[PDB]
Design a binder for this molecule. Structure first.
Ligand SMILES: CCCCC[C@@H](O)[C@H](CCO)SC[C@H](NC(=O)CC[C@H](N)C(=O)O)C(=O)NCC(=O)O
Ligand SMILES: CCCCC[C@@H](O)[C@H](CCO)SC[C@H](NC(=O)CC[C@H](N)C(=O)O)C(=O)NCC(=O)O
Lengths: 219, 221
C-alpha cells in the first residue's frame, strides 16, 4: 500500500491532506494533474466517486471529499480525540477553520481588485471571528493543544491556516500571544518541523504556473 | 435539556438537514426563530455562537455550530453513522458529496432572478451527471433498500432531502433512475420520515419572499 494523492502540483484543497499525513508521520506519493486530458482520463475510469479531486488512494480505497479524507486519516492515527465529547470539539474547530482557509483557497482565482478586498476580509475574520476563540481556549486551559492535550486534526488545520495567513499578513498574530506560542511549539513537533523544512511535499504559495494550470484543467 | 433547540430563521436554509435527521431519528425538538438583526446580535454578543454564526443547536447541554458537525453528532447519538469505520467512511463521503449538490438549492433563492433559470438547468445537470448515477449503481449493486449496510444512515436522510428538494423544481429529475425512484418510495415510507413529510411536522416549505427578505434583513450590513 501507501497513500497516493491525485491533484495538480500546488496547494489548493489537497494541502490540508498533505499536512495531516506529514503530521502523522505518513510518507506519501503524488500523481500530479497537469492537463485537462489527464483529468478526463481519471474521470473516464471510475476512479473519482463524484468526478472531482482531491482523491487519495489509501488502504486499498479511493477516497474523495477533503473533509472525509481528513476524518479517515485522523481516525487511523489518533488525531480525532479519545471520545465523542473531544471528537465533537475537534470537528467543529476544523469545520470553522476550513471556512477561513476557504478564503485562501479561492484567493488565487479572484480578479486582482477582489484579491486585495479578500486579504482584508481574511484579516477581519481571523482577528475577530476565529482567532479569539482559539486564543481563549489556549489561555484558559493553558495546554499546547486545543483538545484533550494531544495533537488533533484541529491543531494541524489551524496551524496550516495560520501559517498560510501569515504569508499574506505577516503581523496577523501580533494581538494573539498564546497563538504565537502555540504555533511555535506545534512547529517543533518532529514531523511538523520536517514537513516545514525544504524537500518535504509541502507546497509553496501558488505561482502563475499553478493558476494557469488549474484554469487549463478545471476551466 | 434532552430536547434539542434549533436557532435559525423560520425557513429551510442550512438548518433543514438538521430538522430532517432529528425527525428521522424520532427526536422531538423545539425551535427559536431568528426574525431580526437585534436577535442575532444578542446571540452573538452573548457568546452562544462559537464562530458568530448559525445554524446553532442546543443539544445535550452543548451549543453546537457548523451544519456538518451538528449532523455528525446527531448521527453518532442515534446509530446513523454505520457500525464500523468502513461504513462510516462511505457515509461520510456520500453526505459530503450530497451536501455539495444541496448547496445549489440553499443558495438558489439569493441569485439574481435572471440567473435563477440558468441555475435550475445547471442544478439538473450536476445531479444527473455527477451524483444520481453513483447512487443508482450502489442501489442496483446490493439491491438493498439503503445506501450503506442494511440500515438507515445519515447519507440516506440527506440524499432523500436533496432528491425531494430537486423534484420540487424539476419534477421528472428521477425518470432515468428507477432504483432511486424505488429507494425514494421506501425511505419516504419509513414511519419517522413519513410523519415528517405530513402536514404538521416541523418540515419547512420552499423559501418564499417573506423568508428571503428576512435573511437579508438579518444577515446584511
Ligand atoms: C475556479 C477555478 C478552480 C476551481 C476548482 C477549485 O475548486 C479547486 C482547485 C483549487 O486550487 S478543486 C477542483 C474541484 N474539486 C472540488 O471542488 C472538490 C470539492 C469537494 N467539496 C472537496 O472538498 O473535495 C474539481 O475536482 N473539479 C472537477 C470538475 O468539476 O470537473
Ligand atoms: C445570501 C444572504 C445571506 C445568506 C446566508 C446563508 O449562507 C444561510 C441562510 C440560508 O437561507 S446561513 C447564515 C450564515 N451562516 C453560515 O454561513 C454558516 C456556515 C457554516 N459553514 C455552517 O454550515 O454552519 C450566518 O450565520 N452568517 C452570520 C454573519 O456572518 O453575520
Amino acid at each position: 500500500a501507501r497513500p497516493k494523492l491525485h491533484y495538480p502540483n500546488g496547494r489548493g484543497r489537497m494541502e490540508s491532506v498533505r499536512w495531516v499525513l506529514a503530521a502523522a508521520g505518513v510518507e506519501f506519493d503524488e500523481e500530479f494533474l497537469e492537463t485537462k486530458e489527464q483529468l478526463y482520463k481519471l474521470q473516464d475510469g471510475n476512479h473519482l466517486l463524484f468526478q472531482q479531486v482531491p482523491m487519495v488512494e489509501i488502504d486499498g480505497m479511493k477516497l474523495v471529499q477533503t473533509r472525509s479524507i481528513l476524518h479517515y486519516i485522523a481516525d487511523k492515527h489518533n488525531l480525532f480525540g479519545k471520545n465523542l465529547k473531544e471528537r465533537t470539539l475537534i470537528d467543529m474547530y476544523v469545520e470553522g477553520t476550513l471556512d477561513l482557509l476557504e478564503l485562501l483557497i479561492m484567493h488565487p482565482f479572484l480578479k486582482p481588485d477582489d484579491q486585495q478586498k479578500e486579504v482584508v476580509n481574511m484579516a477581519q475574520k481571523a482577528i475577530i471571528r476565529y482567532f479569539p476563540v482559539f486564543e481563549k481556549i489556549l489561555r484558559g486551559h493553558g495546554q499546547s493543544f486545543l483538545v484533550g492535550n494531544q495533537l488533533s486534526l484541529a491543531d494541524v488545520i489551524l496551524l496550516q491556516t495560520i501559517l498560510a495567513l501569515e504569508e499574506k499578513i505577516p503581523n496577523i498574530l501580533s494581538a494573539f500571544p498564546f497563538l504565537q506560542e502555540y504555533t511555535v511549539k506545534l512547529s517543533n513537533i518532529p514531523t511538523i518541523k520536517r514537513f516545514l523544512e525544504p524537500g518535504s511535499k509541502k507546497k509553496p504559495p501558488p505561482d502563475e504556473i499553478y493558476v494557469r494550470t488549474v484554469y487549463n484543467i478545471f476551466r
